Amino acid sequence: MEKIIVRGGKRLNGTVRVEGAKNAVLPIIAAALLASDGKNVLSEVPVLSDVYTINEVLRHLNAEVVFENNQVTIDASKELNIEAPFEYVRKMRASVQVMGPLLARNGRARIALPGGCAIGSRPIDQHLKGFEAMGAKVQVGNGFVEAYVEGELKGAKIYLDFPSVGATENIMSAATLAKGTTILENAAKEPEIVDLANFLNAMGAKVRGAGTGTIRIEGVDKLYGANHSIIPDRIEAGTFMVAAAITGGDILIENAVPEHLRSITAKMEEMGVKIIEENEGVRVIGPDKLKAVDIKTMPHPGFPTDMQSQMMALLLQADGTSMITETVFENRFMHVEEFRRMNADIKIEGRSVIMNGPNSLQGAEVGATDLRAAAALILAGLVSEGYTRVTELKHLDRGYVDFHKKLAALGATIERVNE
């Protein structure tokens, strides 16, 4: 199997350029299905496995998708199909994101219910709650959730029990073509939501409030193809901020958007890390001694759950007790064991992990449990004695393009073998 081999205690110094946001492009590509004429041209699209999966789903739904030089040209002018099979949904959970758009285009959708996940149960209840409110009738059969609307989608007043990113994307996307105005209260405020909103409006929608807890969508007759550029990946940028801080280096993330990284920056500053908001992006200088802080993941603008595992690697080198309490995804600690393989002193209790640094991490053969954990294990290896060997790279490839190459360009002793 293909794996990444990491070593040394080299300081990472240089510049890195983040890719387009994974968590924004996926729902955006899905939203392209709303354009009944003519073509959407998405720019800054990263060559991630998930992008390939979402593109195939779209082709399966009878849409032409051409992906070249970080650009996805989508044509959804012909009538679309309604079924998104289980083979795609098990591979990529985000495939459910096509439900809203399909439901808005044809008045019905049939999506395979998601399978067990390592990150933790991420149900779609909230998505269905939204569609039922807009006049959709939901039933389940043969592993699929069927949704069909009587007449057409109605704009409705909807309340999310919790600010689900996925639910907000589907409900917001579906509302663009519904009759009347839809009021989505307690919506996801994540930066990716704002970019999806800007995309919907670009196609000809009337979405207001993206970024706030109350999104208002006034439905229109039809949407059109637009030219949109996907925002930088703040999580990828975050991962690099940790690389600098964990090795005590100087990394310039040229295209990082300070505005989408405040929570991360604030926390790293509490640890003694220095962060300069340059003219272009963001520069991160790491200190020789990190201070221990507590992290509590929460819905944006709170600290992002997608940085949880990465921060864990960083805290293991911090002087003092540190804990991360996860309030979004429990159990998102399947990677704890892998850190223990590397001599980490970690304790899992309830929805929190407790670590004491500074540890003396020992390189070992470890396996990526999931996307973000893969980056974390690799990060851990940058400061652990001996050679760290991370397997199950199919997870890394879902959210990071040429990760080992960027780290090598920063001076890391890294390589990708069986390549």
Task: Specify the helix fraction band.
Answer: 25-40%
Instruction: Compute the number of strand runs.
Output: 25
Strand content: 25-35%
Classification by helices and strands:
alpha/beta
Total of helices: 14
At the first level of CATH, the class of the largest domain is: Alpha Beta
Subunit organisation of the chains: monomer
CATH topology of the largest domain: UDP-n-acetylglucosamine1-carboxyvinyl-transferase, Chain
- Whole-Å distance between the termini? 9 Å
So, CATH architecture of the largest domain? Alpha-beta prism
Structure description:
The protein starts with a strand and ends with a strand. It is built from 14 helices and 25 strands. Strands 18, 19, 20, 21 and 22 form a 5-stranded mixed β-sheet that branches. It has a 4-stranded mixed β-sheet with strand order 23-24-1-25. 30% of the residues lie in helices and 25% in strands. With 419 residues, the protein is an alpha/beta fold.
Explain the layout of strands and helices:
Blueprint: E1 3-6, E2 13-16, H1 22-31, E3 39-43, H2 49-60, E4 64-68, E5 71-75, E6 83-84, H3 86-91, H4 99-106, E7 108-112, H5 125-133, E8 136-141, E9 144-149, E10 157-159, H6 165-175, E11 181-185, H7 191-202, E12 207-208, E13 214-218, E14 227-229, H8 234-247, E15 250-253, H9 262-270, E16 274-276, E17 282-285, E18 290-291, E19 295-297, H10 308-315, E20 318-326, H11 336-341, E21 346-349, E22 352-357, E23 365-367, H12 371-381, E24 388-391, H13 396-399, H14 403-409, E25 414-417
Helix pairs in contact: 1-2, 1-7, 4-6, 5-6, 6-7, 8-10, 8-12, 10-12
